[PDB]
Amino acid sequence: MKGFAMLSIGKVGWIEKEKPAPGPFDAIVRPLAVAPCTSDIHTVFEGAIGERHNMILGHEAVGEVVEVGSEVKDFKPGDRVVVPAATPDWRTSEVQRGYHQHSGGMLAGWKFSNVKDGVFGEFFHVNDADMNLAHLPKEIPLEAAVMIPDMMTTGFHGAELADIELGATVAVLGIGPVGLMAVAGAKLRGAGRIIAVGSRPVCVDAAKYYGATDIVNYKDGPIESQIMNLTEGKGVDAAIIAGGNADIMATAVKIVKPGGTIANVNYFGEGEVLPVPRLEWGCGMAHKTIKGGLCPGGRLRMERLIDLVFYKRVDPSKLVTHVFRGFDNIEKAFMLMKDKPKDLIKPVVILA
Amino acid sequence: MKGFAMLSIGKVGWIEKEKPAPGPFDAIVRPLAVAPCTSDIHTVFEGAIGERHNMILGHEAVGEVVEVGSEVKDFKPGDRVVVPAATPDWRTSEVQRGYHQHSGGMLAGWKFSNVKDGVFGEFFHVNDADMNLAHLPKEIPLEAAVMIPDMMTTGFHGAELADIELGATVAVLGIGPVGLMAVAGAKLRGAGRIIAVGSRPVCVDAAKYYGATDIVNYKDGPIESQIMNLTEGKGVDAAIIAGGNADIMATAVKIVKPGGTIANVNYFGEGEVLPVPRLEWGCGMAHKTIKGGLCPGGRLRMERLIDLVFYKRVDPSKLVTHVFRGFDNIEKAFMLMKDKPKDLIKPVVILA
Amino acid sequence: MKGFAMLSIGKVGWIEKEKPAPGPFDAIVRPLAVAPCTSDIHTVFEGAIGERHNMILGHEAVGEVVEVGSEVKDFKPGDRVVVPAATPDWRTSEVQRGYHQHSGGMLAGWKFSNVKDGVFGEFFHVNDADMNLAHLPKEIPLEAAVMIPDMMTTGFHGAELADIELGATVAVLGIGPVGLMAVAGAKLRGAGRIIAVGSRPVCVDAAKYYGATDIVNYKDGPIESQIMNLTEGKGVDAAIIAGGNADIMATAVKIVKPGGTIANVNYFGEGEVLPVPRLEWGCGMAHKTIKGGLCPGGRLRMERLIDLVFYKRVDPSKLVTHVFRGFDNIEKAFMLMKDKPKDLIKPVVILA
Amino acid sequence: MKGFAMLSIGKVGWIEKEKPAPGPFDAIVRPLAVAPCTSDIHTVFEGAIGERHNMILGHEAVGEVVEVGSEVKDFKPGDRVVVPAATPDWRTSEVQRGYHQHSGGMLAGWKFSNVKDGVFGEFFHVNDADMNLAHLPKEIPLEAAVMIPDMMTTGFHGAELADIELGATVAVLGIGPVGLMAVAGAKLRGAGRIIAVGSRPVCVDAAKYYGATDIVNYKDGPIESQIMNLTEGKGVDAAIIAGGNADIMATAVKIVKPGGTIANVNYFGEGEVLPVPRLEWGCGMAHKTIKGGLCPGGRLRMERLIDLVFYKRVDPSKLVTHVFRGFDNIEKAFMLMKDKPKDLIKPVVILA
Ligand SMILES: NC(=O)c1ccc[n+]([C@@H]2O[C@H](COP(=O)([O-])OP(=O)(O)OC[C@H]3O[C@@H](n4cnc5c(N)ncnc54)[C@H](OP(=O)(O)O)[C@@H]3O)[C@@H](O)[C@H]2O)c1
Ligand SMILES: NC(=O)c1ccc[n+]([C@@H]2O[C@H](COP(=O)([O-])OP(=O)(O)OC[C@H]3O[C@@H](n4cnc5c(N)ncnc54)[C@H](OP(=O)(O)O)[C@@H]3O)[C@@H](O)[C@H]2O)c1
Ligand SMILES: NC(=O)c1ccc[n+]([C@@H]2O[C@H](COP(=O)([O-])OP(=O)(O)OC[C@H]3O[C@@H](n4cnc5c(N)ncnc54)[C@H](OP(=O)(O)O)[C@@H]3O)[C@@H](O)[C@H]2O)c1
Ligand SMILES: NC(=O)c1ccc[n+]([C@@H]2O[C@H](COP(=O)([O-])OP(=O)(O)OC[C@H]3O[C@@H](n4cnc5c(N)ncnc54)[C@H](OP(=O)(O)O)[C@@H]3O)[C@@H](O)[C@H]2O)c1
Ligand SMILES: [K+]
Ligand SMILES: [K+]
Ligand SMILES: [K+]
Ligand SMILES: [K+]
Ligand SMILES: [Zn+2]
Ligand SMILES: [Zn+2]
Numbered sequence A, B, C, D: 001m002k003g004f005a006m007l008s009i010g011k012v013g014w015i016e017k018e019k020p021a022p023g024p025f026d027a028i029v030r031p032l033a034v035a036p037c038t039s040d041i042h043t044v045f046e047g048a049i050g051e052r053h054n055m056i057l058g059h060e061a062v063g064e065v066v067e068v069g070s071e072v073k074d075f076k077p078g079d080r081v082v083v084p085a086a087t088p089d090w091r092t093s094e095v096q097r098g099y100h101q102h103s104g105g106m107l108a109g110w111k112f113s114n115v116k117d118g119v120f121g122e123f124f125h126v127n128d129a130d131m132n133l134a135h136l137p138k139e140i141p142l143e144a145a146v147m148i149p150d151m152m153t154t155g156f157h158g159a160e161l162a163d164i165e166l167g168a169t170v171a172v173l174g175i176g177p178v179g180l181m182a183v184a185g186a187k188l189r190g191a192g193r194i195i196a197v198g199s200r201p202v203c204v205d206a207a208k209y210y211g212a213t214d215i216v217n218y219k220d221g222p223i224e225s226q227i228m229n230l231t232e233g234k235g236v237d238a239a240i241i242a243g244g245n246a247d248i249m250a251t252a253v254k255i256v257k258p259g260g261t262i263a264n265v266n267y268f269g270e271g272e273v274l275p276v277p278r279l280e281w282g283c284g285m286a287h288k289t290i291k292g293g294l295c296p297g298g299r300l301r302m303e304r305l306i307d308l309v310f311y312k313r314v315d316p317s318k319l320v321t322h323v324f325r326g327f328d329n330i331e332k333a334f335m336l337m338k339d340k341p342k343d344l345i346k347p348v349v350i351l352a
């Protein structure tokens, strides 16, 4: 049918398509709430993943099941489901290795608006419904639930990769929606001091809400010097990268103490090389582990985060600053992500 | 000096001993606040660690440094410090393996009221001050800080041993002071649903405060049946044992799902064998990992738990139900632990 | 078709069933070489997993694909394959948790001769062929290859569970075919000293071949005292249980040092409880981790063990002491596992 | 007391100092066998660790204890010992975090020929003898034992950091003495295929001896293309960096599959930045972990590696290509490392 799609490199618009058909194990979902992402901007305007032709955008959606294949057992038409941004193929060798995000190739667990039609349409296709859908409790509002498919699972993954010990000091570089969930994720991993690096006031306020004990604004000086002064030269036990340019990797290495971990969940769109400073990395021997992973998807990941919201461990509704209602307003919410206003964190479009 | 001591098996009383002298790396501390433990009850009236003669009891104390050895660098007379219940020798082979709790032998990190005069005296000896003391911030009151040396580090260790994934369902068997900190620890590891098992109303109330979402009373029926009904037959991702008799190990194995973890921090004082049910343990193949560890000690452990309290990640003051004043009430608080009233969780003696 | 089956508890015999039909993702395999297992003895004559009716026995087989479903992509009729004893359903919640051995329930990844007709028949059914089959290189003979499905993956799993550090001292309690692979697995994890506990000379000879540095005969005296004398009172860093009765769990705990690991891969067929000694387990606080897991299965596991054999890291051929030829000798080889002669390690029936 | 020392940047020569005196916990050792290292060449002629003045060189030594402090308990005059290159202070906060290599600061566990007179003297000082010395069994020759302090512990550390699963494919970039021990280390962790990258025939021969299944010579083409062709486009499960310049980091990321690990133990002496390719690192999301650590030291590490040699798990004598006799030949063996002949791997000077 109609869908907000990438017409060509650098240009987008509504196009004409056929309604997707479900396989024996798949399901067709109609969206109830959707959200745009900064990653979709990188695909369109920077060409970071190559050239696409008439591909629907969007990968964050909470919808209602309308049709299932003959083999779907746990979902029926009428069920209220959370759809993860990553819907991998669960029958490959990379799944047996424990990295479903790369099932079938690097980043191949991320299908929506990458190698597969996204969620910005009246219907979309979800492969392996029993493995890639989670029921949505009535107690969770749509605006909060639509932060789970991507923002919550990415930010929490950064905290998971960070290997946070109880009471450790954690720095979160960047407090966009992913970084704000990284701040909340560190609090969920038992972090004591959480130092957040950001400038936008609407984000700084939300960072304190999610557990940040210190805010480092670049208006006071270089980030490295500020954090080293805050930690009295000790540094941080772990740094979570959730924003910035390639140089932020150098900053993370400089502020993490020997034996610590740099956990990256930032999608670097430009630059050939990510710099690792030789001297500050101990010339290769400082035991500063560097991790960088795509957000996990699938049913279990969604079910675990739904319980965190259900039992009031984290409230993602603070991420939602703008709410829209039309299918035509999907374009408007997208435009907000193109040129970030200072009062926007994450916009949500309620469809039905 | 004076000290409340274990005279023989079944008898305690105040005695007179010589004030301990510090070695070049040691410190002499006078207590500012102390707390009795159920373990000392087991030592005196059950002979759980054998017979002692004129051994000062107690291993939970916040104190003021009065004297240090010539080689102590980070602590001077007058410093208010949190003293860990475990003060191990940091120069053994077990420390290089990462198990300071067993530095020099099984449970050898536990010295106070075991192989060394405890803290229930006008002064006590702390070996290796720079490695086994942590500075106490003025912002933390004495009643809350004296929960850190033993209760918090033990309860949090149960949560650490449990290998909790984000959103996992955790059962805490026993909600005494250690179990209440296991509940708080489970919340500090991103647990979603936390099922606490206990009956005493003062403990049930504190368990809800520290994050318990469900309360299971053993007076209403078998714990296994209740928890399986709550989890709709799925079981729990992890069970933390913090109380009960030897049979509670069988209960933990039965409620943990295949691949889960049983983390024990309960001190079993009676029974020759802890039963592991064959069928419910998968006849040996259910991947139900069983862990059991003594609480971590040392400076770094105390500093990180102090940071957790300082940055308001947990408030252990709700563990304290009775506060008395002065040395003479150490006896009153000790006997309070033997005859457990239904309103007692943890008593504190302020030595101002 | 014909099949050697368990009629009821205590009864075995040849039966007749319908040749299995493959689903779209399944494959029908005819066996080229099979081996009986001690686990089937426990299932039939001890009723360790309950009563079965006309369940064809056997779960260790190398076969030839004769039929595949329409969706099988990597295997065709005529391919010679190694079939893992564990062939789990790869589309479950337990797979997303990382425990395919319990996909769909405790031990539910083990289907052959458990909840599904085994391999001791003219044909057998393999669910999810592309995920549960591995190609057999021509360089590996059938007698050696049939040690991979069960013996090698189980024994190596014991070493994996043991958390062996480079140079650590490992004890292997029991040197049947599984224990001998635990010896080889421990060598493959960088173990230094490997202490093997067994009495049968044919097993003692194979233990030395696979890397055992010391032999402890339990008929020669108490295991604990002998091992404690060998390690000069230190104990072992890890103990792998691969045989014995329920009492061997107490033996393992007594010989492992504080902080070490007890890794069980032994299938306990009798007894209600596996005893854990309270005092030797530190009264619950010795950090002696107890693990017990079913062997991993699936394509990737088989492929990696095949690579270990291909690149000559392990030669499982020395496990095979008896080779017979023909379907009728499946009964003879099965009975050989029942009345264990002193010269038997593992028998193989060639159906070529 | 004489010692071969670094006079200034670019100059070396023999000096005279006063024989060092041990503190109460230290020991004075006279060397029985020493070996020069490439790190000392970089220190003297490239100033890789800054400018030093009149510092005795050398950090690889087997020696005889001649004097101990009053508090040394496990070592007496006359004991033959293996001295780790890293002799950290075991009483710091970084030790309680589990990183003794950085006890007191980044790389602060490395004292010999860094902040302390090295082992190229008639005597040298060992701090904390009971924690930093290991008894040398008479069964291990000096030439083999002197490979343990540095080469073996470094190379094996690369294999440990690599997170090798049983049967995994491992690439070792660089086959100098450290890389050759990384190959042996990969074999110890259960690697199947081991791909070694090198050109010198004496190293290629030793690489096959230690377990390499494939050799990649740059004379046949680019390393990235050769390795991807060998693995049929799959890549390797882990890459161990043990040589080369900063550009080798980019090669490692390119050949490791998503979810794998890059383990670096190479000492990068020049360059401001270590390049990480953005696209081949999944734009930050490929789950390609990068680790880089200094070699472990201390008594326990040495004792476990001694056991590996004692029980014949690894023979490091293949690393020794040149053997000299007498103190005066320390200069000759040192200069041998500066202008490496194609037949040199590691030289050893036998003393006494
Ligand atoms: N791994 C995954 O699965 C995944 C999932 C979702 C998104 N992503 C991508 O990863 C990144 C997450 O960012 P986001 O979604 O939270 O929105 P975002 O607005 O792009 O986050 C960027 C944050 O980093 C700050 N920043 C910019 N330059 C910086 C610099 N040199 N140093 C320090 N901070 C700097 C920004 O500050 P100000 O804006 O206040 O000026 C902002 O706080 C995005 O690129 C996103 O597309 C990845
Ligand atoms: N690992 C360490 O380093 C360490 C440190 C300190 C203490 N410990 C020991 O760990 C244990 C923790 O006890 P505590 O200090 O927290 O005080 P506690 O009051 O003795 O804790 C006992 C808890 O277990 C419950 N309980 C008793 N029987 C039960 C049963 N059949 N089923 C379910 N629950 C049952 C009790 O419920 P109700 O009382 O509400 O009825 C209570 O909640 C103690 O034995 C202590 O000596 C260990
Ligand atoms: N986890 C899994 O997936 C899996 C897979 C396959 C098999 N298994 C099971 O694991 C167990 C391994 O047995 P197996 O197949 O290798 O053949 P097995 O011959 O039955 O192994 C028994 C071993 O234990 C020894 N033993 C008997 N009593 C002992 C005692 N008190 N103390 C110490 N050792 C004692 C035996 O010594 P001697 O015979 O020399 O006297 C023998 O070495 C079996 O029960 C098997 O069913 C499990
Ligand atoms: N982390 C620690 O504690 C520790 C301990 C000891 C040493 N190290 C350092 O780790 C490094 C290991 O070197 P080493 O001691 O084993 O002696 P080495 O001779 O310097 O090892 C260099 C090896 O790497 C090869 N090589 C050179 N350039 C290469 C490239 N672009 N790509 C792949 N291979 C290349 C060399 O072959 P060709 O030159 O013949 O082409 C040679 O085989 C040294 O720098 C050493 O200082 C670190
Ligand atoms: K690290
Ligand atoms: K487990
Ligand atoms: K352990
Ligand atoms: K990884
Ligand atoms: Zn996104
Ligand atoms: Zn206590």
Ligand SMILES: [Zn+2]
Residues within 6 Å of the ligand: C037, C038, C039, C040, C059, C085, C150
């Ligand atoms: Zn079997």
Ligand SMILES: [Zn+2]
Residues within 6 Å of the ligand: D037, D038, D039, D040, D059, D085, D150
């Ligand atoms: Zn060196």
